[PDB]
Design an enzyme around this catalytic site. Structure first.
Site, PDB file in Angstrom:
ATOM      1  N   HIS A   1      -7.249   2.830  10.957  1.00  0.00           N
ATOM      2  CA  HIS A   1      -8.165   2.431  11.737  1.00  0.00           C
ATOM      3  C   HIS A   1      -8.559   0.962  11.660  1.00  0.00           C
ATOM      4  CE1 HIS A   1     -11.609   2.906  14.404  1.00  0.00           C
ATOM      5  NE2 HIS A   1     -12.503   2.533  13.581  1.00  0.00           N
TER       6      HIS A   1
ATOM      7  N   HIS B   1      17.728   4.871 -11.325  1.00  0.00           N
ATOM      8  CA  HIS B   1      17.039   4.859 -10.154  1.00  0.00           C
ATOM      9  C   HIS B   1      18.267   4.987  -9.133  1.00  0.00           C
ATOM     10  CE1 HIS B   1      13.437   3.758 -11.876  1.00  0.00           C
ATOM     11  NE2 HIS B   1      13.907   2.745 -12.510  1.00  0.00           N
TER      12      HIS B   1
ATOM     13  N   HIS C   1      15.755   6.880   5.122  1.00  0.00           N
ATOM     14  CA  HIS C   1      15.581   7.824   5.965  1.00  0.00           C
ATOM     15  C   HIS C   1      16.164   7.357   7.413  1.00  0.00           C
ATOM     16  CE1 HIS C   1      11.617  10.133   4.332  1.00  0.00           C
ATOM     17  NE2 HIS C   1      12.397   9.777   3.480  1.00  0.00           N
TER      18      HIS C   1
ATOM     19  N   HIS D   1       8.727   9.125  -9.583  1.00  0.00           N
ATOM     20  CA  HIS D   1       9.209   7.653  -9.232  1.00  0.00           C
ATOM     21  C   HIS D   1       8.512   7.414  -7.892  1.00  0.00           C
ATOM     22  CE1 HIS D   1      12.716   6.821 -11.871  1.00  0.00           C
ATOM     23  NE2 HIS D   1      12.172   7.846 -12.490  1.00  0.00           N
TER      24      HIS D   1
ATOM     25  N   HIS E   1      12.862   5.371  -0.184  1.00  0.00           N
ATOM     26  CA  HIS E   1      12.063   5.557  -1.498  1.00  0.00           C
ATOM     27  C   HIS E   1      13.016   5.942  -2.610  1.00  0.00           C
ATOM     28  CE1 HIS E   1      12.124   9.978  -0.996  1.00  0.00           C
ATOM     29  NE2 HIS E   1      11.936   9.512   0.236  1.00  0.00           N
ATOM     30  N   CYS E   2      12.678   5.898  -3.927  1.00  0.00           N
ATOM     31  CA  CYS E   2      13.855   6.315  -4.861  1.00  0.00           C
ATOM     32  C   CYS E   2      13.630   8.084  -5.051  1.00  0.00           C
ATOM     33  CB  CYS E   2      13.307   5.884  -6.258  1.00  0.00           C
ATOM     34  SG  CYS E   2      14.422   5.932  -7.646  1.00  0.00           S
TER      35      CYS E   2
ATOM     36  N   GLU F   1      -8.194   5.016  19.135  1.00  0.00           N
ATOM     37  CA  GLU F   1      -9.023   4.515  18.057  1.00  0.00           C
ATOM     38  C   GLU F   1      -8.471   4.681  16.840  1.00  0.00           C
ATOM     39  OE1 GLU F   1     -12.674   6.640  17.643  1.00  0.00           O
ATOM     40  OE2 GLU F   1     -12.006   8.412  19.005  1.00  0.00           O
ATOM     41  N   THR F   2      -7.963   5.761  16.607  1.00  0.00           N
ATOM     42  CA  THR F   2      -7.532   6.236  15.107  1.00  0.00           C
ATOM     43  C   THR F   2      -6.427   7.355  15.312  1.00  0.00           C
ATOM     44  OG1 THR F   2      -9.692   6.413  14.152  1.00  0.00           O
ATOM     45  CG2 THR F   2      -8.031   7.515  13.082  1.00  0.00           C
TER      46      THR F   2
ATOM     47  N   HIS G   1      -9.241   5.988   7.642  1.00  0.00           N
ATOM     48  CA  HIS G   1     -10.806   6.621   8.279  1.00  0.00           C
ATOM     49  C   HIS G   1     -11.109   7.911   7.513  1.00  0.00           C
ATOM     50  CE1 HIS G   1     -14.134   7.190  10.760  1.00  0.00           C
ATOM     51  NE2 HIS G   1     -14.057   5.969  11.296  1.00  0.00           N
TER      52      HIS G   1
ATOM     53  N   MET H   1       7.827   2.963  -5.986  1.00  0.00           N
ATOM     54  CA  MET H   1       9.277   2.740  -5.372  1.00  0.00           C
ATOM     55  C   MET H   1       9.349   3.433  -4.033  1.00  0.00           C
ATOM     56  SD  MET H   1      11.864   3.319  -8.652  1.00  0.00           S
ATOM     57  CE  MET H   1      13.122   2.141  -7.976  1.00  0.00           C
TER      58      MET H   1
ATOM     59  N   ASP I   1      16.984   5.723  -1.347  1.00  0.00           N
ATOM     60  CA  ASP I   1      17.331   6.698  -0.244  1.00  0.00           C
ATOM     61  C   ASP I   1      16.676   6.463   1.115  1.00  0.00           C
ATOM     62  OD1 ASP I   1      16.731   8.931   1.113  1.00  0.00           O
ATOM     63  OD2 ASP I   1      16.167  10.388  -0.151  1.00  0.00           O
TER      64      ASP I   1
END
Ligand SMILES: [Cu+2]
Ligand SMILES: [Cu+2]
Ligand SMILES: [Cu+2]
Ligand SMILES: [Cu+2]
Ligand SMILES: [Cu+2]
Ligand SMILES: [Cu+2]
EC number: 1.7.2.1
Lengths: 334, 334, 334
Positions: free
Chosen positions: A249, A89, A94, A139, A129-130, A273-274, A300, A144, A92
Site C-alpha cells: 500500500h 546451495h 520460477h 535457506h 530462490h535456493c 488502493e491495496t 497494510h 536466499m 531455482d
C-alpha cells in the site's frame, strides 16, 4: 536453431533497491545475457536493538539482485560457491521450465562453480530462490531469494493497448525472519548455522514471523536511504515475496496500473488502493506522482507494518496542488 | 476553477448497517457535500460473556458511518474532538491524494476541531481510518475505521455495459479485537486506554485475534437485528476490512456481481461463491435473491466465523421454488 | 416443466485423486444423475510418526469423491448414515440455491437416509461440506468436505474462445488438521469423538494447524502413489480447500490456464506461477507438460509445504529438450 550465432552481452548486477542499466524496448533479436552471482553467508543486524542472525545471500545482500532480460532471450548464469562457506546451495528459477526450475542441475558444494542456461519464454516478474533437498524453508527464510523481470519485446501496455513507459524502476523485497527466542523471551545467538538449524525449525513451525523487513533491515528504506521521485515522474515498483502473502500500500497514492500476479500477458488492474501479492510470487505497480512530500510504502497488515518493521519512504519533489486536497480550517480550539 | 460556484449539500450520517439517503445516478454537476463526525471513546461489550474493551469510534459506533458521494464531487469533512477525550486523533482517507491521505493535516488534540476538503477522483469503495504517529495499529484495531463509496456519475454497469440498479444497500464492517488476557487465561480490565496500551501491543504482536465481529459485537446482525429483503429484490452489500484479510460468503446464495477490490473502473466477476477481500480495503457484492428463508453471511474461515463470532443473518420473504431445490425423500429410517 | 421426462443415469464414485468416467461435452439434454454416498467415521493415521485422529468421511476417504455433472443437469444425491456412527450429519453444497445450500433438509441421525435433488445452474468447481448446527468447524476440519464440477454444455474455452480439451483430470484436496497436544508437547488420543470435541475446540481457537496434508496423509501423493503424465499430455488439476487459504505451485512448470476462483463464466488467467485459492473454494488449473522427469506440487507457503506435509509428486515420461534448459558447465571445483 544454433545458439552460437546469437550475440552475447555481459551485465553487472547492482545492490537493491536499484536496478542495472537496460532498455525498455528491445533493439536486437534474441541474445545471451551473462550474469554472475557469488553466494555468501554472513551475520546480519536486522533491527534497532541489534538482533543478529546468520543470513545466506546471493551477492551479499537481502534480497538478491534483480535481473532484467527480454522475452525469448537466453539467460546464462554462473553461480560460484566460495571455499569459506559451509553449506550446499542451488538456485531455482520460477521462469525456467523443467528440472525443478533448475534446482536439480545447480547443486554446488563449498568451493565449486556451475553454469546454467535457460530460455525466458514468458514475460513478467518471477521469483528465484535456493532449494536444497531437506532444508528449503530454512535457506529461503534466511535471505536466499530474489526476482527476475522478463520484459516483452515491445514494452508494457495498458488495458487498451497504448504503451506504458516508466522513468524509474525500484525493487522492494519483503523478508520474514523467524528468530528463535529462549525461555526468558530473549533472542538467541549461535556460531554457525549448523547450531541454529534445530531452533530455527522449531520456531518456523509456529507460522508467525518475528521480524518482517523491507530490504533486509528495519528502517532500511526510511531516512536518508528513502526512495526518490518528482511530481510527474513515472515509477515502476517491483515488489517480491517468497514465503508469505503481502498486501502493499502506498499511503497518499494509489496503483495506476497493477499486475498483482506479475504476468504481463494479462490486462492490469486500475486504481488499486491495496492489492494482494501471494506468497512465492512478484508483483508490479506503475504509478505517476501528483503531489510532493513524503509517502509511506507499507504492508497494510498494519501490525506487520508498524510493529514488525515493514515500512519504507518515498521523497517526492514538486509543488503542492490546492485543488486535489486543501486544509479549509486548520485545527482550532472550537 | 472556482470552488465557490458549485452547489452545497449537507448530509446527516446514519448508524450502520444502514446508509443515508442518496441517488444512484447524479442529477447535478460537481457539488460540495458536507459531513460531520464527532470522535468518542467509550467502553464496549463485544461478546455474550460480557468482555469489555476501550473502543474509540467515529460518531460513537463500530464501524464508522458509510459516506456516499459521486465521482468528481468535493467532500468536505468537519471533524470534532470533544474535551472529554484524552488522545490525539486524525482521519486518513484512501480516496484522497497526497499528504498521507489527509493525516498530516487533520491532527486534532482533545477539545479541538478541523475541516478538510478533498476531491473524489476515482469511483469505488475505499477505507478510512485513524493514523496517529506511533499508535496506528492500536487506534485502528479499536474501532476507528469505516468506508466511503464514490459512485460513478452514470451508475454501476455489468461486464458488458448494461446498467445495474440496486433496491437496498447494506454496509458490513468486520473488526478484529486483540484483547489482552492475563496468566490465568482471563481477559483483563483497565480504567483508561493509557493503562491498556502496553498489553495491547504485546497481544497484537502475536498476529492472532481474540475476537472477530460483524458490526462491533457478537450476534450484532443475528436475531431481531438481522438484515431484511424479499425474493426478487436487489441488494448491494459493502463489506469492509482495515487490518486483516477476509473472505465473505453468503450461505445458500452466490455473488451475482463482485468487485473484490472495490474499484468500479474494472469489470466485475460473475457467480462467485467466496471472494477474497485484502486487508485494508473494501469490496462490493450485488445479489438478487431467489428463495425465501434465512441466510447466513459468514467469513468462510469457519473457525473465525463460528468460533470467534463473524456471522450475520438475512431474512428474506417470499415463496419457495420446488424446481431449484426439493426434498425428494425426507429423512427416514432405512 | 416435468422432471419425469428427463433421462436418468447412475454413476459410481471413485476414490481420489481419480475421477469417475464422464464426457467433456454433453451429448444429451438435461438429465438426472444419481450418486450415492455413505458417511463413515474411522481412525486415520496422518503422518509418518503414526499420529492418529478420529476422521469423519464421505465414502470413507479424505477428501470426499469429486462429482462431475453438466450445466442445467439435475443432481440427485442419496445420503446414508449407518447405525454404527454416533453423530448427526448433513451435506451442504455451494452450487445449490436456498435452504443453506441444502443443510436444512439433509439432517440424518445415525441409522437413517435422505435424498436431495437440486439443479446445477452455474458452471465451475464448487465445494461441499458437512455443517451441523453448533459443530461446523469441527466436522469440516476432520475430513467431511469435497468438490463438485459442473462443466459447461459446450466445453472449456480459453480467453479468446477456442475450445480446451484435457486428456487427464486429477483432484487434489488440501486438508488442515488441528490435533490437540497435551502439556508435554505430545499429541493426545481418545476413544470416541465426544471425548475429543473439547480439546479440538481449544486447539482450533489458535488458528494455526498442526498438519496440512494432500489427500489425507503425509506423502499420500509421493512415491508409488504419485500422479502420472507424458510430455504433450493435457492435465486438469482441480484443487480444493474448505477452511484455509492456499497457494498451489507446480515446481518446474506453470499454469497455462487458471481459474483461481473456479468459475468458468470468467476468462482464465495466463502463465501463472502461483495463484491464490481462497478458503472455502475450489480452483482449476490446466497444464500441458513439456519436459520429462519428476515435478513437485506444493503449497508455496514453504513452511506449510516442507514442514507440515503439503507436497505431492508428478512423474512425466518423455524426452529432454536441451533448448529450453541446459547445463552448460556442470558443477566443477573452480
Ligand atoms: Cu541456500
Ligand atoms: Cu518457489
Ligand atoms: Cu484515533
Ligand atoms: Cu490505510
Ligand atoms: Cu458431519
Ligand atoms: Cu461453506
Amino acid at each position: 536453431v544454433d545458439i552460437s550465432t546469437l550475440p552475447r552481452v555481459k551485465v553487472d548486477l547492482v545492490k537493491p533497491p536499484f536496478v542495472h542499466a537496460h532498455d525498455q524496448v528491445a533493439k536486437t533479436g534474441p541474445r545471451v545475457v551473462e550474469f554472475t552471482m557469488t553466494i555468501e553467508e554472513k551475520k546480519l543486524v536486522i533491527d534497532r536493538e541489534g538482533t543478529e542472525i546468520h543470513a545466506m545471500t546471493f551477492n551479499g545482500s537481502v534480497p538478491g539482485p534483480l535481473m532484467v532480460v527480454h522475452e525469448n532471450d537466453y539467460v546464462e548464469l554462473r553461480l560460484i560457491n566460495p571455499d569459506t562457506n559451509t553449506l550446499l546451495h542451488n538456485i531455482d528459477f520460477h521462469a525456467a521450465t523443467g528440472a525443478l526450475g533448475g534446482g536439480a542441475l545447480t547443486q554446488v558444494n563449498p568451493g565449486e562453480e556451475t553454469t546454467l542456461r535457460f530460455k525466458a519464454t514468458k514475460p513478467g516478474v518471477f521469483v528465484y530462490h535456493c532449494a536444497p533437498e531437506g532444508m528449503v524453508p530454512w535457506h529461503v527464510t534466511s535471505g536466499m531469494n530474489g526476482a527476475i523481470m522478463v520484459l516483452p519485446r515491445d514494452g508494457l501496455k495498458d488495458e487498451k493497448g497504448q504503451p506504458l513507459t516508466y522513468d524509474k524502476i525500484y525493487y522492494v523485497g519483503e523478508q520474514d525472519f523467524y528468530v528463535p527466542k529462549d525461555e526468558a523471551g530473549n533472542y538467541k545467538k549461535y556460531e554457525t548455522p549448523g547450531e541454529a538449524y534445530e531452533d530455527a525449525v522449531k520456531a518456523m513451525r509456529t507460522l508467525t514471523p518475528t521480524h518482517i523487513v523491507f530490504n533486509g533491515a528495519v528502517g532500511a528504506l526510511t531516512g536518508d536511504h528513502a526512495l526518490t521521485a518528482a511530481v510527474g515522474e513515472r515509477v515502476l515498483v517491483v515488489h517480491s515475496q517468497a514465503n508469505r502473502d503481502t498486501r502493499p500500500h502506498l499511503i497518499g497514492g494509489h496503483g495506476d496500473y497493477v499486475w498483482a500476479t506479475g504476468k504481463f500477458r494479462n490486462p492490469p488492474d486500475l486504481d488499486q488502493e491495496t492489492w494482494l501479492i501471494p506468497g512465492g510470487t512478484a508483483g508490479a505497480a506503475f504509478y505517476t506522482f501528483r503531489q510532493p512530500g513524503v509517502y509511506a510504502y507499507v504492508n497494510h497488515n498494519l501490525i506487520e507494518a508498524f510493529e514488525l518493521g515493514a515500512a519504507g519512504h518515498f521523497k517526492v519533489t514538486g509543488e503542492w496542488n490546492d485543488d486535489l486536497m486543501t486544509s479549509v480550517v486548520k485545527p482550532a480550539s472550537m
